[PDB]
Design a protein around this nucleic acid. Structure first.
Ligand code: MG
Ligand code: MG
Ligand code: MG
Length: 660
DNA sequence: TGAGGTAGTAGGTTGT
RNA sequence: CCUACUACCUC
């Protein structure tokens, strides 16, 4: 199993803190008028920033790595109107212990402030936050592309600086939203006001006069009175958007699509060079790239009717559990009837599978109106389970409407763009897999022994002020989804998690004849304090064992091999109850960083299962998703519900995956 | 709307 | 940490 290797990650070990840095200067803060119980953290922190030097926040005070005699121990900070005045008092020096978690926390704070305060005063270039840009990758007429490392410098257990490096580019332009438009470039989709820092969604140009424009004063007079039209020359009008709003000599463009990924090996090179450079110029010593041992993991045994290397091959071999089913066709283009090949391809797959299938054809059209909805009612009534939609590229709005309409009839839909050709294999072969998943068929499954019988993933909606908390089970070592719950933010209500979970327990109970022994709980991103409290409590009582795991996409940094190829499916244990995974294999892989939040399973065992769940995804076809099937499924569910409403999911079978 | 990835651009979860 | 969108590559 454990085909052990050794690969170092994009971190670096540097000189151990000196005695002085272990004894930071302590200061006291006297801000009058006294802040509100609620207005402290953001204020008390902007006071340190104001105080100058490498100083951070120290609980109810400040802590510095700079002699008080070079700080601004008096001044006045302003936050949200009120102008409170501050006053620092030098109050000794307390020794800090890196061995302690709580103490080390502030030292690492100072260390980041150090890195920022010392990088800013280099003859180099910009320093946008944690970022740094040495050279220039390109300098076209109107745009400039500078390249950089994004950095972080913290303190370890032993008390030595740790410097994490990761190369990154930046697209910055000089020309105005007018000189750039006159230079001969199409209208951007994003603009940022040059008096402020707020941005807009540039909709069009205004066929109106600046001076004679009626504002809610005079348009050209507004920006004039505010002294914004000095040293410049406002051009023509422009309808920005949040309902339009007048605004082009004052606006600036946000370049993105207009006007290259770093090669895998050519990235680790620039990573070390930037390190040698940041330690040499900052007097932090010779960077010792931190290496770690990895483990090649067991290959997944994905199996249709017969074992298979990828879900797409399940089309010529057969499905894992194909039941009798009938699909439908909806052409929003000209012609009628299934294309010859899409039919041959389906009958073969269902031939192999052994189940019988009947292709239908909807002789209706959306434009008919309600006549159209009954065309569906009749289709469903005749036994149709899912419908393939051949239509030229639709608009987002028209797309959701049609999707939502069919769902209101209990018919998931897989869209496929009419400009189609037989030799576009991957295209329509995936279209079929996606249709079939939506129909309720289990394309492939996993052969093997896994610690948990049930695997559920939780995520959170998007868009509008509110989100949708949602989860989706995976019965036995078939997949299904549950009815989501609209919530205020990203934290999922404690009893909402439980109820969502309970549904998957009971789903499993329906499939097997018994409650699960053990469940694998996968939360997308960080797991807000105690959002799984009520959940894990219950599982305990009900005598079913568990494992919670933060699956984080960002923050896994990089991981390069000491020498040779980078193997697919590396298990890279890090600290305690936390490890990496490079679950996939053009650019440079971004490893997932998992964190065992509760349970007693060996990390090696979790990593194994998690990695295997990767290949369980139905509409994947010729490539597997980066995270586990359940977590990836919860993502899309949550996404589509938030996209086109929860109101439609009412009459939709939970075993049908409409969101894929 | 074939799907997966990584790579940009914004804006901003939770709990400092 | 996450929520989106856009562009390139790949089967
Ligand atoms: Mg999330
Ligand atoms: Mg997500
Ligand atoms: Mg799909």
């Amino acid at each position: 199993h454990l085909g052990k290797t050794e690969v170092f990650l994009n971190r670096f070990a540097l000189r151990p803190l000196n005695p002085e840095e272990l004894r930071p200067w302590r200061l006291e803060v006297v801000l009058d008028p006294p802040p509100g119980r609620e207005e402290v953290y953001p204020l008390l922190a902007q006071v340190a920033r104001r105080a100058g030097g490498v100083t951070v926040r120290m609980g109810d005070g400040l802590a510095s790595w700079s002699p008080p005699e070079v700080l601004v121990l008096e001044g006045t900070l302003a936050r949200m109107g009120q102008t409170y005045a501050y006053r620092l008092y030098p109050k000794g020096r307390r020794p800090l212990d890196p061995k302690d978690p709580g103490e080390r926390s502030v030292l690492s704070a100072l260390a980041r402030r150090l890195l920022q305060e010392r990088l800013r005063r280099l003859e180099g270039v910009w320093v946008e936050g944690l970022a740094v840009y040495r050279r220039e990758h390109a300098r076209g007429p109107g745009w400039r592309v500078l390249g950089g490392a994004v950095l972080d410098l913290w303190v370890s257990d032993s008390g030595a600086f740790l410097l994490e490096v990761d190369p990154a580019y930046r697209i910055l332009c000089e020309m105005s939203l007018e000189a750039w438009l006159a230079q001969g470039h199409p209208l951007p989709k994003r603009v940022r006001n040059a008096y402020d820092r707020r941005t807009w969604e540039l909709l069009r140009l205004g066929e109106e006069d600046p001076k004679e424009l009626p504002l809610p004063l005079s348009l050209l007079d507004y920006h004039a009175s505010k002294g914004r039209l000095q040293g410049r020359e406002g051009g023509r009008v422009a309808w920005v958007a949040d309902k339009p709003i007048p605004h082009t000599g004052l606006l600036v463009p946000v370049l993105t699509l207009e006007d290259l990924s770093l090669p895998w090996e050519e990235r680790r090179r620039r990573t070390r060079e930037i390190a040698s450079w940041i330690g040499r110029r900052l007097g932090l010593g010779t960077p010792e790239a931190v290496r770690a041992q990895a483990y090649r993991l067991s290959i997944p045994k994905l199996m249709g009717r017969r074992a298979v290397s990828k879900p797409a091959d399940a089309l010529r071999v057969g499905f894992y559990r194909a039941q009798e089913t009938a699909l439908a066709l909806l052409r929003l283009d000209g012609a009628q009837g299934w294309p010859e090949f899409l039919r041959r391809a389906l009958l073969r797959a269902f031939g192999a599978s052994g189940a019988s299938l009947r292709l239908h054809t909807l002789h209706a059209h959306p434009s008919q109106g309600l006549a159209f909805r009954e065309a569906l009612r009749k289709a469903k009534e005749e036994g149709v389970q899912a419908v393939l939609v051949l239509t030229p590229p639709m608009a987002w709005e028209d797309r959701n409407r049609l999707k939502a309409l069919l769902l209101r009839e209990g018919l998931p839909s897989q869209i496929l763009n009419v400009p189609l050709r037989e030799e576009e294999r991957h295209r329509w072969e995936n279209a079929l897999l996606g249709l079939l998943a939506k129909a309720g068929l289990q394309v492939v499954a996993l052969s093997g022994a896994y610690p948990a019988e049930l695997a559920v993933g939780f995520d959170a909606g998007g868009r509008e002020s509110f989100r949708f908390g949602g989860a989706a089970c995976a019965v036995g070592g078939h997949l299904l989804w549950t009815l989501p719950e609209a919530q205020a933010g990203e934290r999922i209500p404690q009893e909402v998690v439980w109820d969502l979970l309970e549904e998957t327990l009971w789903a499993f109970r329906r499939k097997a004849g018994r409650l699960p022994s053990r469940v694998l709980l996968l939360r997308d991103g960080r797991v807000p304090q105690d959002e799984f409290a009520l959940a894990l409590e219950a599982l305990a009582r009900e005598g079913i064992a568990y494992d919670l795991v933060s699956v984080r996409k960002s923050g896994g940094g990089r991981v390069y091999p000491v020498q040779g190829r980078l193997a697919d499916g590396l298990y890279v244990p890090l600290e305690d109850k936390t490890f990496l995974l490079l679950t996939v294999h053009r650019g440079t892989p971004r490893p997932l960083k998992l964190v065992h939040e509760a349970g007693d399973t060996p990390l090696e065992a979790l990593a194994h299962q998690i990695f295997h769940l990767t290949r369980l995804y139905p509409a994947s076809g010729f490539a597997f998703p980066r995270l586990p099937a359940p977590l990836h499924l919860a993502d899309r569910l949550v996404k589509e519900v938030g996209r086109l409403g929860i109101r439609h999911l009412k009459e939709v079978d939970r075993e049908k995956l409409f969101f894929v």
